[PDB]
Design a protein around this motif. Structure first.
Motif, PDB file in Angstrom:
ATOM      1  N   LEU A 163       0.211 -13.781   5.154  1.00  0.00           N
ATOM      2  CA  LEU A 163       0.081 -13.032   3.896  1.00  0.00           C
ATOM      3  C   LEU A 163       1.298 -12.151   3.681  1.00  0.00           C
ATOM      4  N   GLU A 164       1.946 -12.290   2.555  1.00  0.00           N
ATOM      5  CA  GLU A 164       3.186 -11.567   2.230  1.00  0.00           C
ATOM      6  C   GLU A 164       3.065 -10.965   0.834  1.00  0.00           C
ATOM      7  N   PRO A 165       2.582  -9.727   0.725  1.00  0.00           N
ATOM      8  CA  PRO A 165       2.453  -9.072  -0.589  1.00  0.00           C
ATOM      9  C   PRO A 165       3.700  -8.946  -1.387  1.00  0.00           C
ATOM     10  N   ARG A 166       4.915  -9.059  -0.823  1.00  0.00           N
ATOM     11  CA  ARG A 166       6.096  -9.074  -1.622  1.00  0.00           C
ATOM     12  C   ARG A 166       6.130 -10.236  -2.595  1.00  0.00           C
ATOM     13  N   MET A 167       5.353 -11.296  -2.301  1.00  0.00           N
ATOM     14  CA  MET A 167       5.263 -12.516  -3.063  1.00  0.00           C
ATOM     15  C   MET A 167       3.998 -12.619  -3.943  1.00  0.00           C
ATOM     16  N   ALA A 168       3.250 -11.498  -4.080  1.00  0.00           N
ATOM     17  CA  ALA A 168       2.041 -11.524  -4.914  1.00  0.00           C
ATOM     18  C   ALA A 168       2.411 -11.798  -6.363  1.00  0.00           C
ATOM     19  N   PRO A 169       1.553 -12.445  -7.154  1.00  0.00           N
ATOM     20  CA  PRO A 169       0.208 -12.828  -6.792  1.00  0.00           C
ATOM     21  C   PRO A 169       0.072 -14.025  -5.879  1.00  0.00           C
ATOM     22  N   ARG A 170       1.080 -14.865  -5.747  1.00  0.00           N
ATOM     23  CA  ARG A 170       1.031 -16.002  -4.815  1.00  0.00           C
ATOM     24  C   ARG A 170       1.559 -15.575  -3.460  1.00  0.00           C
ATOM     25  N   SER A 171       0.823 -14.643  -2.840  1.00  0.00           N
ATOM     26  CA  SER A 171       1.248 -13.979  -1.614  1.00  0.00           C
ATOM     27  C   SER A 171       0.883 -14.720  -0.351  1.00  0.00           C
ATOM     28  N   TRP A 172       0.101 -15.788  -0.427  1.00  0.00           N
ATOM     29  CA  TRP A 172      -0.212 -16.563   0.779  1.00  0.00           C
ATOM     30  C   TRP A 172       0.915 -17.555   1.009  1.00  0.00           C
ATOM     31  N   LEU A 173       1.628 -17.385   2.099  1.00  0.00           N
ATOM     32  CA  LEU A 173       2.682 -18.302   2.475  1.00  0.00           C
ATOM     33  C   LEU A 173       2.117 -19.287   3.486  1.00  0.00           C
ATOM     34  N   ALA A 174       2.223 -20.567   3.178  1.00  0.00           N
ATOM     35  CA  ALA A 174       1.910 -21.635   4.098  1.00  0.00           C
ATOM     36  C   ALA A 174       3.247 -22.022   4.765  1.00  0.00           C
ATOM     37  N   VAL A 175       3.251 -22.002   6.093  1.00  0.00           N
ATOM     38  CA  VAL A 175       4.429 -22.149   6.902  1.00  0.00           C
ATOM     39  C   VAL A 175       4.224 -23.294   7.920  1.00  0.00           C
ATOM     40  N   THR A 176       5.150 -24.247   7.923  1.00  0.00           N
ATOM     41  CA  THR A 176       5.217 -25.291   8.917  1.00  0.00           C
ATOM     42  C   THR A 176       6.540 -25.172   9.655  1.00  0.00           C
ATOM     43  N   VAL A 177       6.460 -25.300  10.970  1.00  0.00           N
ATOM     44  CA  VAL A 177       7.638 -25.453  11.824  1.00  0.00           C
ATOM     45  C   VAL A 177       7.543 -26.820  12.461  1.00  0.00           C
ATOM     46  N   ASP A 178       8.628 -27.567  12.348  1.00  0.00           N
ATOM     47  CA  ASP A 178       8.779 -28.843  13.062  1.00  0.00           C
ATOM     48  C   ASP A 178       9.184 -28.470  14.487  1.00  0.00           C
ATOM     49  N   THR A 179       8.341 -28.756  15.457  1.00  0.00           N
ATOM     50  CA  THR A 179       8.659 -28.292  16.795  1.00  0.00           C
ATOM     51  C   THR A 179       9.864 -29.070  17.351  1.00  0.00           C
ATOM     52  N   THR A 225      -2.773 -26.579  14.276  1.00  0.00           N
ATOM     53  CA  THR A 225      -3.182 -25.409  13.508  1.00  0.00           C
ATOM     54  C   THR A 225      -4.158 -24.594  14.329  1.00  0.00           C
ATOM     55  N   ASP A 226      -4.572 -23.450  13.790  1.00  0.00           N
ATOM     56  CA  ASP A 226      -5.715 -22.743  14.328  1.00  0.00           C
ATOM     57  C   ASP A 226      -7.009 -23.311  13.749  1.00  0.00           C
ATOM     58  N   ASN A 227      -8.095 -22.682  14.105  1.00  0.00           N
ATOM     59  CA  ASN A 227      -9.402 -23.131  13.671  1.00  0.00           C
ATOM     60  C   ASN A 227      -9.907 -22.503  12.400  1.00  0.00           C
ATOM     61  N   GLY A 228      -9.036 -21.976  11.575  1.00  0.00           N
ATOM     62  CA  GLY A 228      -9.381 -21.464  10.264  1.00  0.00           C
ATOM     63  C   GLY A 228     -10.059 -22.565   9.410  1.00  0.00           C
ATOM     64  N   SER A 229     -10.914 -22.111   8.509  1.00  0.00           N
ATOM     65  CA  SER A 229     -11.734 -22.972   7.663  1.00  0.00           C
ATOM     66  C   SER A 229     -10.866 -23.863   6.776  1.00  0.00           C
ATOM     67  N   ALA A 254       3.020 -20.500  19.218  1.00  0.00           N
ATOM     68  CA  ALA A 254       4.016 -19.466  19.309  1.00  0.00           C
ATOM     69  C   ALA A 254       5.157 -19.713  18.358  1.00  0.00           C
ATOM     70  N   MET A 255       5.493 -20.988  18.164  1.00  0.00           N
ATOM     71  CA  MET A 255       6.661 -21.295  17.307  1.00  0.00           C
ATOM     72  C   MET A 255       6.393 -20.917  15.864  1.00  0.00           C
ATOM     73  N   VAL A 256       5.210 -21.257  15.330  1.00  0.00           N
ATOM     74  CA  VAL A 256       4.912 -20.897  13.939  1.00  0.00           C
ATOM     75  C   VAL A 256       4.722 -19.400  13.786  1.00  0.00           C
ATOM     76  N   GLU A 257       4.204 -18.717  14.809  1.00  0.00           N
ATOM     77  CA  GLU A 257       4.113 -17.250  14.752  1.00  0.00           C
ATOM     78  C   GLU A 257       5.484 -16.617  14.654  1.00  0.00           C
ATOM     79  N   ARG A 258       6.435 -17.164  15.410  1.00  0.00           N
ATOM     80  CA  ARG A 258       7.805 -16.692  15.305  1.00  0.00           C
ATOM     81  C   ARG A 258       8.378 -16.964  13.927  1.00  0.00           C
ATOM     82  N   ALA A 259       8.129 -18.166  13.374  1.00  0.00           N
ATOM     83  CA  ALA A 259       8.547 -18.537  12.040  1.00  0.00           C
ATOM     84  C   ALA A 259       8.015 -17.560  10.996  1.00  0.00           C
ATOM     85  N   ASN A 260       6.761 -17.219  11.124  1.00  0.00           N
ATOM     86  CA  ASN A 260       6.152 -16.257  10.171  1.00  0.00           C
ATOM     87  C   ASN A 260       6.914 -14.961  10.127  1.00  0.00           C
TER      88      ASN A 260
END
Lengths: 141, 141
Positions: free
Chosen positions: A16-32, A69-73, A97-103
């Motif tokens: 979640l990145e409020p600097r980007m609101a209203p579309r503040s949810w950033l979906a992030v993929t890292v190619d390992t 991914t995680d187990n989010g709905s 860990a890699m995507v957390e770093r990317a975030n």
């Protein structure tokens, strides 16, 4: 050719990145394999947002063998499981860990670029797309 | 590393695709080095649309040394010339056979994918983003 190169496995998360609101949810993929990042912004954290994000990521990176991914709905829903099956992409929830770093790298870069442009709080909506793309460029190339 | 590899030169054009209305203007870049394609859709053919497209293309492909376009107003405007200068990208209007081929391959692929999904006329708006991304995937990977 892959050869003996790294396996084609992604990690994906939402941050979640409020600097980007209203579309503040950033979906992030890292190619390992390569550490390449793909980011898209979304109004809501949903299954369909995840699918829209991966559609973009496949256009950019190619079709992966697997996604972690995680187990989010938004990732364990019937809808998302079926979408990944349609594409023939293996899915695991397990670590990422890699995507957390990317975030964190992305949010820091977004802040720096925004403040460079004079935006100390929310980025004006009409400026967000190019700034997000600039952050992605900055981290990949 | 480039080495002796092909020079980092893009060709960019707009092509109108009513299957994608209301955002029926497709901005198309071909990387002449690799033949990779980036496509984005836009409501209107404008300078700012071209800039938004290139922002995306830079995120995907990296920053090019030069971009070839035609002499359309969206590419020769003061606004666009200044945007390319800001990025340090050389611009020529000259010839761009590769992007013309890209336009046709994309429109054909969009039609095939759309008709495969049962859409014989305009693609429903909520389905367009993923279909466009699928066409880009199909032509690149």
């Amino acid at each position: 050719g892959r050869g003996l190169g790294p396996l084609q496995i992604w990690q994906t998360d939402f941050t979640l990145e409020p600097r980007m609101a209203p579309r503040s949810w950033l979906a992030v993929t890292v190619d390992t394999a390569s550490s390449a990042i793909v980011v898209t912004q979304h109004g809501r954290v949903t299954s369909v947002a995840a699918q829209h994000h991966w559609a973009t990521a496949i256009a950019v990176l190619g079709r992966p063998k697997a996604i972690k991914t995680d187990n989010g709905s938004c990732f364990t829903s019937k809808s998302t499981r079926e979408w990944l099956a349609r594409w023939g992409i293996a899915h695991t929830t397990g670590g990422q860990a890699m995507v957390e770093r990317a975030n964190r790298l992305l949010k820091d870069k977004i802040r720096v670029l925004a403040e460079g442009d004079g935006f100390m709080k929310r980025i004006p909506t009409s400026k967000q797309g190019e700034l997000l793309a600039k952050a992605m460029y900055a981290l990949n190339h």
